[PDB]
Amino acid sequence: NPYERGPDPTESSIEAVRGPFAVAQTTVSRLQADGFGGGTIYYPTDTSQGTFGAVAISPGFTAGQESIAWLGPRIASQGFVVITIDTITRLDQPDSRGRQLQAALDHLRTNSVVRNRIDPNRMAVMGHSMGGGGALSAAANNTSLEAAIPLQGWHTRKNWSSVRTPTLVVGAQLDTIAPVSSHSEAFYNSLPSDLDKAYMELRGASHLVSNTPDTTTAKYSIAWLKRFVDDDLRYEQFLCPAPDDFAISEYRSTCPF
Numbered sequence: 044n045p046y047e048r049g050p051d052p053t054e055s056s057i058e059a060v061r062g063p064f065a066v067a068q069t070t071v072s073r074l075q076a077d078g079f080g081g082g083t084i085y086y087p088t089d090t091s092q093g094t095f096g097a098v099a100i101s102p103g104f105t106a107g108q109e110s111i112a113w114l115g116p117r118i119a120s121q122g123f124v125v126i127t128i129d130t131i132t133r134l135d136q137p138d139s140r141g142r143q144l145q146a147a148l149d150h151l152r153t154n155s156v157v158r159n160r161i162d163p164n165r166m167a168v169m170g171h172s173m174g175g176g177g178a179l180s181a182a183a184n185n186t187s188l189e190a191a192i193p194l195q196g197w198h199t200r201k202n203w204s205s206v207r208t209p210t211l212v213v214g215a216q217l218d219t220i221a222p223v224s225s226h227s228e229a230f231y232n233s234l235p236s237d238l239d240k241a242y243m244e245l246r247g248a249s250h251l252v253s254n255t256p257d258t259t260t261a262k263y264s265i266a267w268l269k270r271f272v273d274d275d276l277r278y279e280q281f282l283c284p285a286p287d288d289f290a291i292s293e294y295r296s297t298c299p300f
């Protein structure tokens with residue numbers, strides 16, 4: 044694997060708030076962002092290993108970038124360029140959120156600080172609440188995205204037959220805002236049966252789980268990004284088969300990948 048980055052993984056390594064790569068940050072202003080409300084980019088200083096796949100992350104309704112700020116450094120430390128985006132408006136809907144994510148990854152192709160540190164062919168999308176719905180729309184409008192991860196996703200749309208990108212759907216058990224039955228689960232089973240996919244329910248968690256460091260959320264997001272953005276077969280061990288939980292009330296996948 045030429046995109047393999049970093050030492051072989053451990054259940055501790057993927058659970059670390061910061062992984063191996065030391066990371067730096069650039070702030071995109073609301074003014075210098077075409078199609079989004081700006082954002083904060085996280086990237087590994089180490090270019091010795093090669094270029095890094097990109098990931099865009101959106102917040103949810105009414106929420107600023109702070110909602111999802113913990114995820115940018117935590118994923119980029121493992122070998123990725125991550126943009127934590129603030130929406131054009133706090134009342135932005137999931138479909139716009141899908142546009143603002145393609146806009147944010149596109150911006151990464153021209154950002155001066157991270158143009159040479161990125162691999163423009165291997166990209167992925169992620170979002171919390173409506174942010175997760177966005178992540179789902181950008182995948183359906185682009186069959187080149189290498190991965191997609193909805194987190195307590197919220198959306199009006201449920202059919203996801205078009206989706207052709209490896210998708211990890213994440214739900215919280217006690218969610219009263221975006222119920223799993225009407226959303227997350229509804230999105231996984233609408234996805235292509237033959238694609239590479241997985242659904243994971245988190246135990247005891249409310250809808251606001253992704254708005255605070257959650258180790259279960261981070262480790263599996265980092266394993267999906269590694270298996271599909273870096274084609275890393277070293278991280279398939281953390282997804283196939285299902286793992287011990289305590290935090291996972293439910294899991295279903297299309298293993299083996």
Ligand SMILES: O=C(O)c1ccc(C(=O)NCCO)cc1
Pocket residue numbers: 104172173197220
């Ligand atoms: O899609 C959302 O995230 C969302 C869903 C329902 C509410 C709500 O119950 N509020 C109604 C009056 O404000 C808020 C946000």
